[PDB]
Structure 1
Amino acid sequence: RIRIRLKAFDHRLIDQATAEIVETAKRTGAQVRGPIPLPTRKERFTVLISPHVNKDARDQYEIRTHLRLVDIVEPTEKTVDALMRLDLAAGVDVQISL
């Protein structure tokens, strides 16, 4: 009933953090849809490295941001507070749309 869309840069972190966000829900709400991954946005910035001439030495960079969905089933007040207020993992965005 409530889309839980959460974003973070590390994949071993965003996917660790999705294990407890349903463990704090299935303990009380006892019904979640399931962990849905989403296609990651890879932003590339390839740019020069020398402070002058030699525009042939560049270094390819990439910042990968990931997205996960769990889309919890039950809108019972208990479950609402157990996710809305109980947000964990600093450095991990989580945004909810009921």
Structure 2
Amino acid sequence: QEKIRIKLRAYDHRLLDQSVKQIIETVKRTGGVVKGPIPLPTRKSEFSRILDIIRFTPQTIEALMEISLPAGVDVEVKM
């Protein structure tokens, strides 16, 4: 099926990568599959990562909605 690509950005890279960890664990615990992350070069003090979710279940979405990411971590999506 169709992959979800997530781009995460922040001004704190440890909190950024921890947020990536939490997303990955949540996906895997619900039977989904990821690819990446791809860390991107830091630019003007802003850190970013890309993560693909290449398989997911309706439970994955439910689990993903119930997590709370640290303030300061911005998330963007595309199909």
Counterparts of 1:18-37 in structure 2, within 5 Å, are 18-37=20-39
The alignment's TM-score, normalised by the length of structure 1, stands at 0.68
- Decide whether the 8 Å contact of 1:2 with 1:75 is kept in 2: no
Q: Does 1:66 align with 2:47?
A: yes
Q: In structure 2, list runs of 5 or more residues that go unmatched.
A: none
Query: Is the strand fraction higher in 1 or 2?
Result: 2
1:37-85 residue CA offsets vs partner (Å, 9 max, x unmatched)? 112221xxxxxxxxxxxxxxxxxxxxx01111111111422222333x2
CA distance in 1, matches of 2:71, 2:37: 20
The alignment's TM-score, normalised by the length of structure 2, stands at 0.82
Q: Does 1:92 align with 2:61?
A: no
CA distance in 2, matches of 1:77, 1:18: 20
- Decide whether the 8 Å contact of 1:4 with 1:70 is kept in 2: yes
Which residue in the other structure is 1:4 paired with? 6
Q: In structure 1, list runs of 5 or more residues that go unmatched.
A: 43-63
CA distance in 2, matches of 1:3, 1:19: 15
* SS of corresponding position for 1:67: strand
Q: How many residues align?
A: 76
Percent identical among aligned pairs is 54
Query: Is the helix fraction higher in 1 or 2?
Result: 2
- Decide whether the 8 Å contact of 1:8 with 1:67 is kept in 2: yes
Q: After the TM superposition, list the runs of 4 or more consecutive aligned residues in structure 1 that deviate by more than 2 angstroms.
A: 80-83
